[PDB]
Design a protein. Structure first.
Ligand SMILES: [Zn+2]
Ligand SMILES: [Zn+2]
Lengths: 747, 747
């Protein structure tokens, strides 16, 4: 990271940097060349250089798979590695002999190379381009004029092979393959190298990046999160960070919103004590080895000099072979590292997300709870999971169900289209319109189907479940799925007693609903015995009273239902957690609670089970799940409310807190332990006097929500208790402590 | 206060109550009649009744004044008192002789009474009408048919004499005389009384009230304040409260937004230790008798059963003669009372106000500070005072200058039109456009002036400085003067360390400015020696760099200027306060600080002194002021910033705090005592990394404003200090404690 010293020009209203008229300019400038010897003498970096020396050896003919995967090419070996090390040596020695060998060794094969149609072949093709780009840029003054021309024509030939095409007009700028290596690393790298001879490639590659990719990312970056789920976070954010490094090292400074530094903190918050990461979007499961975000933590931690991110990298400081050079060039070995233990227990991601991640600690006894609005849907690997909550404690308890791969297949599978990516897979809300259709004609790259199953769930946005080209198309289309209404945590910023999130998710559904709102209130109970609780309060108004309403709670093992109580336990894989839901609304007289699951019913969608068993040896804990509970109104009605209170504890915990519903004036609420929480009876803003009664011993902590921001007066037993308290705009809430009595509130 | 039990039907889209088919219905119904005996037996209420018995005596002919003022009539004596007591007695005894006597004693004079035209005479006419309405309603069953007709014609005759006219089509529904007794008490009372025989009067009076008055008041009531200044609060709010009591007692319940209860708390916050009230709008000054809000406190306190307001009534439980009956009927004598001592030290009034009142205590050592945005202007007795601050501590220190009356005259005086109601009289901002025109043709109804003086101040809204008819007309016009941008007070709700308010007041001025912003930060320093400080940060962008800019500070006595330091002291009237302003921006190299004042210069407006000496024996402390300081930039520039730090102490205090300006990355700030406060150097939202250095011993309290809401990271001496703090939407600020070092903030 250094200040920009390049010239900037507008191209069609969009400011862009001009590559400096000097080589090297790819991945480094002369400015950092003398530091290469220090890096070579850096013992942390010597090992990575040794790794690359080993990479110089050709593939053993018998070891070659013959189906040359993207993984084949990313496990980089042979000539391309050799010429890269030659170019590096030329930078450090300036010896005309070494720089020439790099050039003469690569040119012919760069012109002639062939690639059998194979899985993500663009990646191998793009990496082969990168090899040439390194030699071209780093040994530039050694190039003969005829060779430069030969290199250019070879690069154009190779570029045309890429899935984005050349010109790079195909695919999408926020998600999909064009949001991976092909543009942000590969085409951009070549462009920078050959700019003095063929400026077109840079103008096309950087052109699209600055116009689309950059604008789209800068839009959500301030909220410090990513939208492709907890696996594809890796490749997608890695390539964002490649563009960051490539352009800063070119001389363009940081081109992104610097909030980029804080995106990977989400992964940190979602890490479990078993080494796995809380689920979200397209993910598979394992208990074999911990999940790591090595490349993003390397690139982001080193650039932004972030100790929390460097800790993450140091967990497994082992970069994929094709990335070794980039670790050598860009890693900060002087940077320290910090365990996450002193991070606030709750973190909030605002627009366009509206996601809360709440913990009760950083150790083995941690409850980890996720609450999501989703203001927009990004599609691709994101799920239609507006309103979803997810809870982990000593095992996955309230689960995000299904699996990316399995017996059903991969991304294009019936399981993905009909269960995994759909609302029914999640702890959210269904409203079933028998006449609703779900257009899926543009989903996936093969095995296309025109329509998906009716899950009573959320819309499939886009032109048949097609992601938008860019931010412009996204904002103009039907990708809006919600509105964050309220959020906060406290009273303490470090160890909040409560974590609150409210969203209106009507836009996530068709016109089968008039209104859908969900309010989450997580309680850190500050107790080893019953460490946490979550209260979920829903308003659902269907356009037709006969549209069946569903409240879902997914689990791995079979739930036990007794009255208004659902008990879920983990008893396998060393997990011992327990979840207990008390259903308060609909009331027992209007409540049907039903469990669906087990063999043939694990992925049940209104008449069809979308079977997806794990690949042998994978998902040993069955985190894809086998069970769910559906809470449904007995009586058909346009307007229904759900109120559910979840307690979390060890499966050996016998005594859980008594849960009381509070039926007040204008409010409905919950009381358990020393906590009182209220919501508007209509889930709409309360702007007039209201009240309720409290019965019980000791001091209670009150969170009153859905209140008109401004000054409130609190009375108890007809006497003013708090003459003036402020409800603020962000949470629309009153907070205070008090004892039992009859409460009135004035505004 | 009882639940509504009458029928409602829409009239031209507006729901209105129908008077019940029963008498009595004026000021009480049958449900309250038996309780009259109990009230007569109440020691507190027997005295007011005895007061009324005394009022029965006629005026002494020699003591009758030449001019029958509104004060003459409100000092109600003779026949009209007698007949009201006869009617009360008829309700209580049901004796036909009594009811008949009330009717016969009043009927002749009611139809023949004459009132010499004066211009406040509507009040005496209206009260005479109320006397007749009492007899009519309370003795209804004793009325003969012929007498009913005589009463109706008499009431219509009297109604036509009122300023609003009959039909009530003249004047204004938010301010002016039609927002006083004539409709909300007087015409409404008669309408209700005679409804069975002549529903037209009620339909017109209540029709206008429900369509216009009620709508306007409900619109601003939730922010718990009033817009007519600290004197006219009395008559204006009193009449709102008459409408409240009249309509509830009729059977319509509470027709107002119940936020009405909290309006009078502002007066409580503005009370000084010397018994007077902080200035605002059209006010005069006395040190003789304390100012009381007796009638509002009686009516609001008793209706809403509010002990703080009842305390305010009990300070001086003496209502004007013409209101004694209403005390007898409506006073709650069982209600308790509370001194203001346990009230939070700061109170916020939101849209359409944006006012902070901040204190350091409730006793003799109280600092009292007012900070105002003004989102809308209501005109009439409100001043064009957007951005103004005012500070009291052992005397008026930073003053709201001028006086309502004096040698210049009253409401229509050149002093009112050219100084008192104008920005120049206030601690606010001037931008002088020499070509600017200020139309005042409609001021004072339709009075003669046409154009007022150029004070370089704020616009005169309306059709030549007149108020709009109602809310509809107000919102469609040019009455918007500002936008609340941010607000909040200190970590503790009860005793906040800081009180913050930011407003954009561009709308208050003409096109001579492109942008005007003012941020206030009040500090409660929690120290006897220097109790408080106020930091004021202004951004002013003029449309012409040659347009002279002014920052004003008004005082009673002569300010002492020394370099960048302005010292102001009170040494008279038993006052001993001191204000010391440190001018930080403009820098001393670009700052000119000039005192203007003394005789012939006390109300100086660019060449002309608008003289307004007190009436003999009034304003003995000269709170109208004699002096001001103007801070002006040396260099002509379109854009200028003002940064001023006011410290408050006893004038005997020799040691005040050193004030350091903090010149940071993207921020400009202030350091004094143990407090750090920063603003955006541009006064625009900061959304990228920034920082500054702190030198000094011990722990400091940091308030960082103008920040993009979301999660921020704090670093000190290159190490993460706070990994994650939240800036919230309402204040857009970070709060934390820290020691000396070099600070960086990431977003
Ligand atoms: Zn999912
Ligand atoms: Zn004023």
């Amino acid at each position: 990271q250094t200040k920009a010293d390049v010239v900037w020009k507008d191209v069609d209203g969009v400011s862009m940097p001009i590559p400096p008229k000097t080589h090297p300019r790819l991945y480094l400038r002369e400015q950092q060349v003398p530091d290469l010897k220090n890096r070579m003498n850096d013992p942390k970096l010597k090992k990575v250089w040794a790794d690359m020396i080993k990479m110089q050896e050709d593939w053993k003919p018998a070891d070659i798979p013959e189906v040359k995967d993207f993984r084949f090419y990313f496990n980089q070996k042979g000539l391309t590695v050799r010429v890269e090390l030659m170019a590096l040596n030329y930078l450090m020695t300036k010896d005309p002999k070494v720089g020439r060998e790099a050039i003469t060794s690569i040119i012919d094969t760069l012109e002639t190379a062939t690639f059998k149609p194979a899985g993500d072949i663009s990646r191998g093709i793009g990496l082969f381009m990168v090899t040439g780009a390194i030699v071209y840029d780093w040994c530039y003054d050694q190039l003969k004029p005829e060779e430069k021309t030969r290199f250019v024509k070879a690069f154009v030939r190779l570029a045309k092979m890429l899935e984005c095409g050349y010109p790079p007009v195909k695919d999408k700028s926020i998600v999909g393959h064009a949001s991976e290596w092909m543009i942000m690393r590969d085409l951009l790298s070549v462009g920078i190298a050959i700019y003095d001879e063929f400026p077109e490639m840079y103008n096309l590659a950087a052109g699209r990046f600055f116009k689309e990719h950059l604008v789209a990312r800068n839009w959500f970056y301030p909220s410090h999160n990513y939208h492709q789920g907890m696996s594809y976070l890796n490749v997608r954010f890695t390539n964002d960070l490649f563009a960051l490094w490539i352009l800063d090292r070119m001389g363009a400074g940081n081109v992104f919103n610097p909030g980029q530094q804080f995106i990977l903190y989400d992964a940190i918050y979602k890490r479990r004590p078993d080494g796995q990461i809380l689920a979200g979007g397209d993910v598979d499961y394992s208990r074999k080895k911990p999940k790591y975000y090595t490349m993003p933590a390397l690139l982001a931690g080193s650039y932004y000099k972030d100790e929390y991110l460097n800790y993450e990298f140091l967990k497994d400081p082992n970069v994929e072979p094709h990335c070794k050079l980039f670790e050598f060039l860009w890693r900060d070995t002087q940077l320290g590292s910090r365990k996450p233990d002193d991070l606030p227990l709750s973190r909030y991601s605002g627009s366009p997300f509206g996601w809360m991640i709440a913990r009760t600690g950083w150790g083995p006894e941690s409850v980890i709870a996720e609450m999501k609005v989703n203001e927009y849907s990004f599609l691709n690997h994101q799920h239609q999971d507006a309103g979803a909550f997810q809870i982990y404690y000593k095992g996955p308890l309230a689960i995000d169900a299904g699996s990316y791969t399995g017996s059903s297949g991969g991304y294009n599978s019936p399981h993905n289209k009909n269960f995994f990516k759909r609302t029914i897979a999640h702890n959210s809300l269904l409203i079933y319109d028998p006449k609703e259709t779900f257009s899926s004609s543009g989903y996936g790259g093969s095995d296309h189907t025109d329509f998906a199953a009716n899950d009573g769930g959320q819309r499939l946005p886009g032109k048949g479940w097609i992601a938008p080209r860019d931010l412009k198309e996204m904002l103009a289309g039907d990708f809006r799925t919600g509105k964050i209404l309220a959020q906060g945590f406290g009273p303490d910023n470090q160890t909040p007693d409560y974590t609150y999130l409210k969203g209106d998710i009507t836009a996530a559904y068709s016109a089968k609903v008039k209104e859908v709102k969900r309010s989450f209130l997580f309680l850190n109970l500050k107790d080893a015995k019953v460490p946490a609780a979550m209260i979920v309060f829903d308003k659902v108004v269907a356009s037709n009273p006969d549209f069946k309403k569903f409240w879902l709670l997914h689990s791995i093992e079979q739930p036990e239902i007794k009255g208004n109580q659902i008990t879920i336990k983990r008893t396998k894989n060393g997990d011992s957690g327990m979840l207990v839901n008390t259903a308060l609304l609909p009331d027992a007289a209007n409540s049907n609670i039903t469990s669906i699951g087990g063999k043939g019913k694990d992925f049940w969608v209104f008449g069809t089970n979308y079977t997806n068993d794990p690949k042998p040896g994978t998902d040993e804990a069955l985190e894809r799940g086998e069970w769910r509970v559906e809470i449904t109104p007995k009586k058909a009605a346009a307007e229904d409310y759900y109120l559910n209170v979840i307690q979390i504890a060890d499966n050996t915990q016998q005594k859980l807190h008594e849960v009381k519903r509070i039926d007040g004036d204008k409010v409905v609420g919950v009381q358990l332990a020393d906590r009182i929480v209220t919501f508007s009876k209509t889930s709409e803003t309360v702007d007039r006097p209201f009240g309720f009664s409290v019965v019980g011993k000791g001091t209670f902590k009150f969170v009153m929500t859905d209140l008109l921001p401004g000054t409130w007066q609190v009375l108890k037993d007809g006497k003013i208790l708090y003459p003036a308290l402020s409800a603020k705009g962000d949470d629309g809430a009153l907070y205070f402590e008090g004892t039992e009595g009859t409460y009135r509130f004035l505004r």
